[model samples]
Target chain A: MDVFLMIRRHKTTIFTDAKESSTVFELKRIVEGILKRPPDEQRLYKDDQLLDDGKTLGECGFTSQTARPQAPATVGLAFRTFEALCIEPFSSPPELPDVMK
Target chain B: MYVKLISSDGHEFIVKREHALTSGTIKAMLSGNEVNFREIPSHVLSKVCMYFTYKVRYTNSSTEIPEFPIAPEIALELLMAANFLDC
Candidate 1:
């Protein structure tokens, strides 16, 4: 069955698609194309448990039938990137100023 | 349904019409505008074909997101190809 998903990050939400029998990594690859972020840098979470990249949505019980309690068409996704995968924020912190050392 | 895609370097790749049209540019070329084929480079278009076929095969209905075969160093060229393909 075709599984639609609501992909959630800290500040954004995206509606996307996946197949019940397809690996979770498949969805990650689509996200990678849309965001241009590599798959290895992404972590996928479903219903509070981190999903394995090697497993399918059906295997994880995130399917078209069991996806949503009310909508019955979409599942939830929550993800965050590794700090090491992100660029240094605020231009390297401006040398931390000697006064605050 | 097979289409012949000729690369800029004189290499010819025969791919399924469904696979070839995965690219927006190629789809436009064959269906509208009346263009016969593409003029992309061999190596670059080759990779684009790989991505296109991967997208075609994995997207919707039958599902399975397989690993896309590409190297880090080739990203620039691949993006250029993707841009040219408008996919």
Candidate 2:
């Protein structure tokens, strides 16, 4: 099954689809396409823990088969800015999941 | 092949060709394989792409298909987009 991801960067969110077998590095490539940042300059986080580039989404617990507390698992995005990688603080609350109704 | 859909704010959503073809608007625009929705914001366009995935997954299923989620706030805008896309 394909999993949906809500990638949050500060106040902006970009959505992408992936599979359980997809690696974090592959996802970074997708982010690169959208954000114009190279995969090597990007960092992805879930629940504040940094995701290893080699790890697959299944290894990171991002699977469509499981019932996630939040649908379309939200992943925080940080990018290398000059000397250090910076993750801007989100000004607003995380978005609520889409409703079935 | 993958298709790139660019939202009004410049966010890009890469979707599979099969899934993207679920939208009539996209199917017609597939010659270039890249579409720019100048009027549709990123949020709404993302939801529309999600709908495309949902539609492709359950189109001819015999079992029960789950409901596609839409946030209440974007319901009207999404409805308009769905109609315009002929999905």
Q: Of the candidates shown, which would achieve the greatest TM-score relative to the real structure?
A: 2
Tell me the tens digit of each residue's lDDT in model 2 across A26-99: 99998887778998888888877889999998888888865221246777778775233233442221254456
- TM-score for candidate 1: 0.41
Task: Give the lowest summed-lDDT range of ten residues in model 1 chain A.
Answer: A84-93
Docking class of 2: incorrect
- Span of ten consecutive residues with least summed lDDT in model 1 chain B: B32-41
lDDT per residue for candidate 1 within A1-101, as digits (tens), equals 66645454532333344778999798888767655677887877675567899999888777765543122232334434353221111111123335445
lDDT of each: 0.57, 0.72
Model 2, TM vs. native = 0.68
List the pairs of residues colliding in candidate 1.
none
